[PDB]
Design a protein around this ligand. Structure first.
Ligand SMILES: [Mg+2]
Ligand SMILES: [Mg+2]
Ligand SMILES: [Mg+2]
Ligand SMILES: [Mg+2]
Ligand SMILES: [Mg+2]
Ligand SMILES: [Mg+2]
Ligand SMILES: [Mg+2]
Ligand SMILES: [Mg+2]
Ligand SMILES: [Mg+2]
Lengths: 287, 250, 81, 68, 66, 97, 95, 87
RNA sequence: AUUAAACCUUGUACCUUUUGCAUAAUGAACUAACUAGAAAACUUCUAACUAAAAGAAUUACAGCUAGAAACCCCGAAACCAAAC
C-alpha cells in the first residue's frame, strides 16, 4: 500500500535507527532520590520496616480463619477420579464441514486428535472422550464413531441419520499409545495388549442400551428400535446401504489399531512389520 | 532469452505479485538479464519496525553470559573473631573486620557468579521478522536478485570494482543455496575481503542484514526462502517435535 | 576448578593403575562387586506391591536396611551376621 | 570472509563404549539398544529376535497379570 | 479488560483502515442511538469498538462478501 | 577530587574483524533447517546454565546438581552456606507477604 | 509459606487449605460451618438447620486462599457425573 | 585510575582557562584570525550606517603610508595612500 | 544594598527524634576515597496467532504465548563441637 512507498523516501534502516514499540517498557525506579529515598517507602521504625513481619495467614495470635473451619472431604480422592473430555455435536459437525475429519473412514480418538478436534492429557487423568447432546437438532452426517462414553440423546441423533456409535474402554497405558502412536513405534517395542475394564465399569460396557463393546450383539436390534419409537423417527436399515462394511467395522476387544495385532513390531525406517514365530509368544499375545 | 520466474506457491487472488530485475556477475555490464516474480506475502509485508527491533535484540541477548563476580563477607579470608568488646573502648560497635563498611571487606550487593540471559521468542514471531527485513531491503532498493554466483576471475580486486560500478554499498552480504557446492571462484575472492561476506542460505538472519548495506540472493535461494517462510502460515500447532516423522513434512 | 572424575569413582580408578593393575583378574572382581547382606535385624517385605489402607490403592514398596556397627572385636570371632 | 559449515546432527546408530568409566549409564541399558533399531531399522545391527521377551521374562509377565 | 470493559475487534484489514471506520459508524449508529466509540491501529491494521457487537459485524461482513 | 592531567591513549576498534562480521549467523538453524537443531544448542557456557535461566537461589541449587560431586572441598562448603542464606532470605524476609 | 523451595525452586501449597475448602472454577470458595457436629443436643432445630449448609466466602478470604494454593488446584476438571457441574460458571452477572 | 577519557578531556579545557589568566596573550589583529573576507566586511560597513559608498574610494581610505613601507621591505626580501582624502 | 571592604536595615546553625513545637536532647575537628531495596502467584501496559495458543508433558465457555514492571545496611549478651 501507500506505507511501503514511504520507505523509499526515508533513510536506510540500520542498527543505529532501531526503536521499540511505544509504551512497551516501563521505567524502573531506584531509591537514590528524595522522592524514593530516605525511608524508601517502608515507613517508620518497626517490625515491618526491618523486614520481619509474620507469615501469610497469621492473625496476631488468635486462631486463624483457615484453621478454625472444620475439615471436610471436598477433595478426597480427587487424584483418582476419572476424567472425560466433552465433544459436542456442534464441534463435530463443524470439523466435518471444513474437511479436518474424513467421514468416509471410521472415526476414533486417533483421527480426532490428528485433526486438532480434541486435546487429550493422559498425565492429567484423561481417559477419553464423551459425546454431548448439544447441537443435536442440526446434526446431518452419516459416520462411524467410537467414543468412551455417550448420552441417550447423543446416540439417537447419530443413528437417526443412519450411523453407528459404540462405546469402548482404554486403559491408561493403551490410551497414551493411541493418542501419540508414532513416538511409540520409534521405541522399538512390540505392541502391547489391551486390558479389560475394571470391575466397577464392567456393567456399563456389557449393556446393550449403552452400545457397549462387550454387550451381546443379538440384543442391539431391540434397543435401537426403542429409541426410534421414543424420539419419533423411523429406524433406517443400513445393510442396504453401499457402505455397510465401513459402518460395521469394529476392532477386537484386545486390539488398539484397526489393522495391527498385539505383539508386532513396526520398523518405520524401511517400511516393514515383524511378527514373532514362537508358540509361547503367540499364545501369550492371542490370550 | 529473458529469464522469467513464477512463484511455485499460490499467490492470494486479491494481491498482485511484485518483481525485480534478474542480474548476473559474469561481466561488468550484465545488469539486466531477466525478470522475476516474488510472492507478495514475503516481499510485500507491512513495514513493522517494532518487530525488527525485537528480533535483533533477541539475537544479541539470548547468548549472553556474564562472568562478573564478587565475594560476600562470608567468603573473604579471616574475620571470625569480634575485634574488641562492646563497651569501654569508645570506638564504634563492630563484630568483624570484613564487613562491607571496612576497607578490605565484602561487597553488599555485587554481581554473583556466571549469569545467563536466555529466553526464546515464539517461532511465528521470529519467522515474521525475516519477512519484514526482506521487504525493507527491496523497497529501499538494496536487494539484488541474481541467477548464479559464478565469476569470471578469482582476483579480489575485480569484485570490488564491480560493486563500485553498479552503485552498491560499502558492505555486501552474499547468499548461496548450500555451503558444499558454492563455486570455487567466489570462495577465493571473498575470503580475503573484510566487508564482502559469503554465507549459505540456512545462515540468513535479521542481524546480518541490518549490518550489511546490500543483499544479494541467487534465484535457487529465493525459492528456498519462499518455501520455508510461507509454511509458517497455514500450519497446525505441533503435536510433538517437528524433527519426528510427519505425514507431509520432510 | 573441578575434578575430572566424580569422587565416588576414585576407588575404581586406583585399582585400574599401578601395581594394583598387575593383581590377578578375578580377585579384583571380588573387591569390585558388593552384594547386600541377608537381612538380620529387620523384616523384609514379602511382596513388591501393597494396598494402602487409607486410600485403598496399590503402592510400590522397598526394603531399606538398618545401619549396623561392627566393633573390631567381631573380626576375631564368628558372629552370625 | 566465508562462514564455517553449518552445524549438523551426527547421523547413524550410536554404540557407546562399555569399558569407559565416564560413559553415562543410561546409554548402556537394553532400552537404549532397542531405540537404535526403532530409529534406524536394520542398519543398527540389533538382532531382531532380542526385541521380544525372553522365556524367563515371559513367566514373570504372566504371573503378574493373573495377580492383578 | 479490567473485568468490566467489553470490546470487539476486527483484525486482518488491508487497504484503507479509515474507510472501514466510517462504514462501521454508519452501520452501527442507528442501533445504539449514538456514534460508537472506536480505536484505529494503523501499525497492526486492527479496529477496536467499545461494546459487544460480534454477531452483527460477522453477518455484516458476510453480506459484503469478504 | 583529583583528575588526570593528560589524555589517556586512544582506543581503536576494528568493526569488521571476523567475530563482529559474522555475528548472528545460524540463529535461524531450526526454522530454515527443518528443525533438526534447536538454536539453544548453539550456546557456549557453563554446563549447568546452557539454555536455562533462573534467580540466584535457583542457580546455586542447579550448579550443585550438575557438578557438585566434582568440586573442591572448600568451594563446596561455601556453596552450601550460600544456599542456606538465600533460603532464609527468600522465605522469611521482605516487604511483601 | 514457601515462595522458593530448595529442590525445585517453586511455590508450595498449604495443605490445610485443601482439606477444608472447595474452589469453583469461576473463583468462589465453599466451606462448612464451625461447630456443625458439636453439642447438637443443646441447639435448637432452626440453629441446627443453618449449620448443615454449604456457604460461600468473602472477597478478602477468597484472595488469601488463592495465594496459599498453586495453579494445579485452579484448573478445569471434567468429572463424569459431577454433582457440581452446574456451579462452575456464572450467568446474568453484571459487575 | 578510572576508565574513560571524557573527564580528562574536560580538565584540559580548564587548564587552558587557568593558563590564559596568568599569562594573557598578546593582542592580534582580527585579519589574522579565521573567518575573514575583506571584500564582504567593507560592504557591510557602509550598509551598517545606512550610507552608500563607492568601493574603490572607501578602500583607499583605509590604506596608510606606513603600510606601504612594510610591504615593499617584505617584497624585496602599487597601492595608493589616503593622504589626499585625509586633508 | 551602596560612590565606598566595615558603620545603616533585615535575620533564634544543620541532621535525627519528639505533640505538625525547640534556647530541649542524640550525632558531626576538617579533606580524599569507600559505604545500604534483591525475587514475578495475581494485576496493568506492548506485540504474535486466534476456538485455539505453545519448538513434547501445560492452560482454555476469548483464550494462549512472549517482553517490560518487586520486596535494604551495621550492631549483642548467649548456646554447641573440636583443639590449645
Ligand atoms: Mg529494583
Ligand atoms: Mg485438558
Ligand atoms: Mg566467616
Ligand atoms: Mg566464636
Ligand atoms: Mg556479628
Ligand atoms: Mg576485597
Ligand atoms: Mg540520656
Ligand atoms: Mg559529639
Ligand atoms: Mg566524599
Amino acid at each position: 500500500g501507500t506505507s511501503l512507498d514511504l520507505l523509499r523516501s526515508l533513510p536506510r534502516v540500520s542498527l543505529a535507527n532501531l526503536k521499540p514499540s511505544p509504551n512497551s517498557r516501563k521505567r524502573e525506579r531506584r531509591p537514590r532520590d528524595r522522592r524514593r529515598g530516605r525511608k524508601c517507602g517502608r515507613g517508620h521504625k518497626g517490625e515491618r520496616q526491618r523486614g520481619t513481619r509474620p507469615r501469610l495467614g497469621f492473625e496476631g495470635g488468635q486462631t486463624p480463619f483457615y484453621i478454625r473451619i472444620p475439615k471436610y472431604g471436598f477433595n478426597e480422592g480427587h487424584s483418582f477420579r476419572h476424567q472425560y473430555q466433552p465433544l459436542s455435536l456442534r464441534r463435530l459437525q463443524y470439523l466435518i464441514d471444513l474437511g479436518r475429519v474424513d467421514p468416509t473412514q471410521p472415526i476414533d480418538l486417533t483421527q480426532l486428535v490428528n485433526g486438532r478436534g480434541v486435546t487429550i492429557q493422559p498425565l492429567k487423568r484423561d481417559y477419553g472422550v464423551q459425546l454431548v447432546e448439544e447441537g443435536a437438532d442440526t446434526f446431518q452426517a452419516k459416520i462411524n464413531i467410537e467414543v468412551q462414553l455417550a448420552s441417550e440423546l447423543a446416540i439417537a441423533a447419530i443413528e437417526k441419520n443412519g450411523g453407528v456409535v459404540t462405546t469402548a474402554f482404554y486403559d491408561p497405558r493403551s490410551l497414551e499409545i493411541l493418542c501419540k502412536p508414532i513416538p511409540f513405534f520409534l521405541r522399538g517395542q512390540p505392541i502391547p495388549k489391551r486390558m479389560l475394564p475394571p470391575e466397577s465399569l464392567v456393567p456399563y460396557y456389557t449393556d446393550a442400551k449403552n452400545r457397549g463393546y462387550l454387550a451381546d450383539p443379538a440384543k442391539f436390534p431391540e434397543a435401537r428400535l426403542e429409541l426410534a419409537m421414543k424420539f419419533g423417527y423411523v429406524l433406517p436399515d443400513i445393510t442396504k446401504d453401499e457402505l455397510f462394511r465401513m459402518l460395521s467395522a469394529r476392532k477386537d476387544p484386545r486390539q488398539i489399531f484397526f489393522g495391527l495385532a498385539p505383539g508386532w513390531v513396526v520398523n518405520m525406517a524401511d517400511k516393514k512389520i515383524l511378527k514373532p514365530t514362537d508358540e509361547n509368544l503367540l499364545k501369550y499375545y492371542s490370550s | 532469452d529473458p529469464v522469467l520466474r513464477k512463484c511455485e506457491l499460490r499467490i492470494p487472488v486479491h494481491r498482485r505479485p511484485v518483481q525485480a530485475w534478474v542480474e548476473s556477475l559474469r561481466g561488468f555490464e550484465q545488469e539486466r538479464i531477466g525478470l522475476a516474480e516474488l510472492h507478495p506475502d514475503v516481499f510485500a509485508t507491512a513495514p513493522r519496525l517494532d518487530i525488527v527491533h525485537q528480533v535483533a535484540i533477541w539475537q544479541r541477548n539470548f547468548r549472553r553470559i556474564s562472568y562478573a563476580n564478587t565475594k560476600t563477607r562470608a567468603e573473604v579470608s579471616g574475620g571470625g573473631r569480634k575485634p574488641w568488646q562492646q563497651k569501654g573502648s569508645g570506638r564504634a560497635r563492630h563484630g568483624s573486620i570484613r564487613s562491607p563498611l571496612w576497607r578490605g571487606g565484602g561487597v553488599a550487593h555485587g554481581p554473583r557468579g556466571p549469569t545467563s540471559y536466555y529466553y526464546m521468542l515464539p517461532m511465528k514471531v521470529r519467522a515474521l521478522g525475516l519477512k519484514v527485513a526482506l521487504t525493507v531491503k527491496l523497497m529501499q532498493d538494496d536487494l539484488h536478485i541474481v541467477d548464479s554466483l559464478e565469476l569470471p576471475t578469482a582476483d579480489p580486486q575485480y569484485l570490488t570494482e564491480l560493486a563500485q560500478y553498479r552503485h552498491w554499498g560499502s558492505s555486501v552480504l552474499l547468499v548461496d543455496l548450500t555451503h558444499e557446492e558454492m563455486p570455487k571462484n567466489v570462495v577465493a575472492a571473498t575470503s580475503g575481503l573484510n566487508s564482502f561476506n559469503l554465507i549459505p542460505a540456512v545462515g540468513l538472519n535479521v542481524y546480518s542484514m541490518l549490518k550489511h548495506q546490500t543483499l544479494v540472493l541467487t534465484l535457487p535461494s529465493v525459492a528456498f526462502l519462499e518455501d520455508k517462510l510461507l509454511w509458517q502460515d497455514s500450519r497446525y500447532t505441533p503435536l510433538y517435535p517437528f524433527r519426528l516423522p510427519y505425514s507431509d513434512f520432510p | 576448578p573441578l575434578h575430572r572424575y566424580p569422587v565416588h569413582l576414585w576407588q575404581k580408578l586406583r585399582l585400574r593403575q599401578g601395581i594394583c593393575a598387575r593383581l590377578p583378574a578375578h580377585f579384583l572382581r571380588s573387591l569390585e562387586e558388593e552384594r547386600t547382606p541377608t537381612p538380620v535385624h529387620y523384616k523384609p517385605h514379602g511382596t513388591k506391591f501393597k494396598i494402602n489402607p487409607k486410600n485403598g490403592q496399590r503402592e510400590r514398596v522397598e526394603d531399606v536396611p538398618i545401619p549396623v556397627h561392627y566393633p573390631p572385636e567381631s573380626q576375631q570371632g564368628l558372629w552370625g551376621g | 570472509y566465508r562462514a564455517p559449515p553449518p552445524p549438523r546432527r551426527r547421523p547413524g546408530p550410536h554404540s557407546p563404549d562399555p569399558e569407559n568409566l565416564l560413559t553415562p549409564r543410561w546409554q548402556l541399558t537394553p532400552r537404549y539398544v532397542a531405540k537404535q533399531f526403532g530409529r534406524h531399522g536394520a542398519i543398527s545391527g540389533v538382532p531382531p529376535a532380542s526385541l521380544w521377551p525372553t522365556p524367563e521374562q515371559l513367566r514373570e509377565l504372566e504371573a503378574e497379570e493373573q495377580e492383578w | 479488560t479490567h473485568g468490566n470493559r467489553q470490546m470487539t475487534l476486527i483484525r486482518k484489514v488491508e487497504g484503507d483502515i479509515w474507510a472501514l471506520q466510517k462504514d462501521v459508524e454508519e452501520f452501527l449508529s442507528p442501533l445504539l442511538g449514538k456514534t460508537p466509540i472506536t480505536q484505529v491501529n494503523e501499525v497492526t491494521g486492527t479496529l477496536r469498538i467499545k461494546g459487544y457487537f460480534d454477531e452483527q459485524l460477522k453477518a455484516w461482513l458476510l453480506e459484503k462478501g469478504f | 577530587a583529583f583528575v588526570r592531567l593528560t589524555l589517556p591513549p586512544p582506543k581503536v576498534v576494528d568493526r569488521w574483524n571476523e567475530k563482529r562480521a559474522l555475528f548472528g549467523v545460524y540463529d535461524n538453524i531450526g526454522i530454515l533447517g527443518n528443525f533438526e537443531k534447536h538454536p539453544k544448542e548453539l550456546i557456549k557456557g557453563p554446563v549447568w546454565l546452557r539454555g536455562w535461566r533462573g534467580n540466584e537461589l535457583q542457580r546455586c541449587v542447579r550448579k550443585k546438581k550438575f557438578v557438585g560431586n566434582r568440586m573442591f572441598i572448600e568451594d563446596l562448603h561455601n556453596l552450601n552456606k550460600r544456599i542456606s542464606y538465600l533460603y532464609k532470605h527468600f522465605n522469611r524476609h521482605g516487604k511483601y507477604r | 509459606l514457601t515462595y522458593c523451595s530448595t529442590r525445585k525452586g517453586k511455590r508450595k501449597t498449604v495443605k490445610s487449605v485443601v482439606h477444608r475448602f472447595l474452589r469453583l472454577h469461576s473463583g468462589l470458595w465453599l466451606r462448612r460451618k464451625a461447630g456443625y457436629k458439636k453439642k447438637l443436643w443443646k441447639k435448637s432445630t432452626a440453629r441446627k438447620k443453618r449449620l448443615r449448609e454449604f456457604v460461600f466466602c468473602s472477597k478478602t478470604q477468597s484472595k488469601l486462599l488463592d495465594k496459599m494454593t498453586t495453579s494445579f488446584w485452579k484448573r478445569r476438571n471434567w468429572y463424569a457425573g459431577d454433582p457440581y457441574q452446574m456451579y462452575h460458571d456464572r450467568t446474568n452477572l453484571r459487575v | 585510575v578510572k576508565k574513560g577519557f571524557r573527564a580528562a578531556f574536560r580538565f584540559q579545557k580548564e587548564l587552558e582557562r587557568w593558563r590564559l589568566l596568568r599569562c594573557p596573550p598578546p593582542p592580534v589583529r582580527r585579519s589574522e584570525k579565521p573567518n575573514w573576507d575583506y571584500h564582504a566586511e567593507v560592504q557591510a560597513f557602509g550598509s551598517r550606517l545606512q550610507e552608500t559608498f563607492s568601493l574603490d574610494l572607501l578602500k583607499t581610505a583605509f590604506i596608510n603610508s606606513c603600510y606601504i613601507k612594510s610591504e615593499e621591505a617584505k617584497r624585496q626580501s602599487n597601492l595608493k595612500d589616503n593622504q589626499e582624502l585625509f586633508e
